[PDB]
């Protein structure tokens, strides 16, 4: 019951970080392999996913510091409560080059995708104008 | 006909900046108030449409040169080609503070998507998780 | 007391879309953590869970809706909205508007609409 | 989807089981399992939620079970008025819900 809390606590951080963020405008998921779940269960498989799961999306929030970085104060908070559940289910049991690199490959995703985007209405410009300077 | 063949080197540049983009994975466009269509047509109004368009895909142009850095040759010749076009248009006829805050605007839209993006999938990793941790 | 009502044209065209509006009194949409549903019958038939709109605002849909389905929302009016695409005689049916109690640890839901039925027909 | 039943009956004060046989994916992820009463011309009503919890004035005649990836709702004492469609839906992952086709309880005699 105790955990019910903590979770909660950072899931309204993380609605508080979102909201943050629409004012101004391969991650890790469950698996039935994963042990979590009644059929399959493996509570020492299950413990290790949610670990190491939290383990790397409390690196992400690290390089989504100056993402957040007119409120910080709310920034610090959902990594440290992260940090504390995460230590609450390591004492409960017995790489980040690989995730910078994801991260890296994202934004040139978005970059790459607005190059098109302006490019391709270029070429359609382009092609209107073509279609009327032949008419004149 | 000099037309046709000046807008189609701007086209074959632009298809081979895309296609250098592809292999590493508000803007202008026509409308019949313009008059470049045959119904409501105004050649004066047209033309300036044309040249007024182009004159703004050629800062994006010049805001995308950091984009094509591995092939500048290319990124210079589209251009170049679109001032000659825009030279030679503006001789058969008698701000740029905005767009780069479009082009920093639409920037952010896609940072807060991949922001939105490692967010929810941390608040959906988390509801699974507690899902979990509440059967052991 | 939660309440929730449906509102929506009885009549839709063949591949036409579907909209429907969910009103919600007694509780802000908004409020922790309570997730929004649409779901709808056939006549003589079972019930269909559409998709779910969150507190957040975020959007789950079954899998074999999910090309024609979207859920909207309107918080300053506490409403939200179903749409749904290219309808066949497929979709007439009767919709409902459910509550989810807690999002975060289970799927079931207390408070119903009272149903709208939708027919589609030219 | 959830198979169940078409028709279940009996007579009045014996007792019926209504089954709900569910995949991995759904009842055999957390067993989110919840029954829903509905009367002809009117919304469905929750009866049960997470395979055994009753809702607030459900009477305990009404019992939830689960066994395997099958969950059972057992209607005790049958009265007259229990004649419904009787609906059990489960959590699919992820964030997903589903229904069954329902059963029919006919109280017969």
């Known amino acids: 019951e105790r955990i019910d809390k903590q979770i909660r606590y950072i899931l309204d951080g993380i609605s508080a970080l979102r909201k943050e963020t629409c004012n101004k405008s391969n991650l890790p998921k469950m698996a039935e392999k994963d042990g979590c779940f009644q059929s399959g269960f493996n509570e020492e498989t299950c413990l290790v996913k949610i670990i190491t799961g939290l383990l790397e999306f409390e690196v992400y929030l690290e390089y989504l510091q100056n993402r957040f970085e007119s409120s910080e104060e709310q920034a610090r908070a959902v990594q440290m409560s992260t940090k504390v559940l995460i230590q609450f289910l390591q004492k409960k049991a017995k790489t980040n080059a690989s995730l910078l690199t994801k991260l890296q490959a994202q934004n040139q995703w978005l970059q790459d995708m607005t190059t098109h985007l302006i490019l391709r209405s270029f070429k359609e410009f382009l092609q209107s104008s073509l279609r009327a300077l032949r008419q004149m | 006909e000099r037309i046709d063949k000046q807008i189609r080197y701007i086209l074959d540049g632009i298809s081979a900046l895309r296609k250098e983009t592809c292999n590493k994975s508000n803007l202008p466009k026509m409308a019949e108030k313009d008059g470049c269509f045959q119904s409501g047509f105004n050649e004066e109004t047209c033309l300036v449409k044309i040249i007024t368009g182009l004159l703004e895909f050629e800062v994006y142009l010049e805001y995308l040169q950091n984009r094509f850095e591995s092939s500048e040759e290319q990124a210079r010749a589209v251009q170049m080609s679109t001032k000659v076009l825009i030279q030679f248009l503006q001789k058969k006829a008698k701000t740029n503070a905005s767009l780069l805050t479009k082009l920093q605007a639409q920037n952010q839209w896609l940072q807060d998507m991949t922001t939105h993006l490692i967010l929810r999938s941390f608040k959906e990793f988390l509801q699974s998780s507690l899902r979990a941790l509440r059967q052991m | 007391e939660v309440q929730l009502q449906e509102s929506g044209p009885g009549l839709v065209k063949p591949s036409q879309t579907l909209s429907l509006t969910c009103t919600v009194s007694?509780?802000?949409?908004?409020?922790?953590?309570?997730?929004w549903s649409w779901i709808r019958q056939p006549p003589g038939k079972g019930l269909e869970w559409m998709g779910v709109?969150?507190?957040?605002?975020?959007?789950y849909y079954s899998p074999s809706l999910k090309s024609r389905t979207s859920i909207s929302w309107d918080t300053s009016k506490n409403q939200f909205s179903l749409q749904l695409s290219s309808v066949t005689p497929e979709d007439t049916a009767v919709y409902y508007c459910?509550?989810?109690?807690?999002?975060?640890?289970?799927?079931?839901?207390?408070?119903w609409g009272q149903g709208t039925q939708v027919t589609v027909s030219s | 989807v959830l198979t169940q039943p078409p028709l279940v009956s009996g007579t009045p004060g014996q007792t019926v089981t209504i089954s709900c046989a569910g995949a991995?994916?759904?009842?055999?992820?957390?067993?989110?399992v919840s029954w829903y009463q509905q009367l002809p011309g009117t919304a469905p009503k929750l009866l049960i939620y997470?395979?055994?919890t009753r809702a607030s004035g459900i009477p305990s005649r009404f019992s939830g079970s689960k066994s395997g990836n099958t969950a059972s709702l057992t209607i005790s004492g049958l009265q007259s008025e229990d004649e419904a469609d009787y609906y059990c839906?489960?959590?699919?992952?992820?964030?997903?819900?589903?229904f069954g086709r329902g059963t029919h309880l006919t109280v017969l005699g």
């Open positions: 991995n994916n759904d009842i055999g992820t957390y067993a989110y």
């Open positions: 709109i969150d507190y957040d605002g975020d959007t």
């Open positions: 459910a509550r989810d109690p807690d999002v975060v640890t289970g799927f079931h839901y207390d408070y």
């Open positions: 007694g509780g802000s949409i908004t409020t922790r953590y309570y997730a």
């Open positions: 839906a489960s959590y699919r992952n992820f964030n997903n819900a589903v």
């Open positions: 997470k395979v055994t």
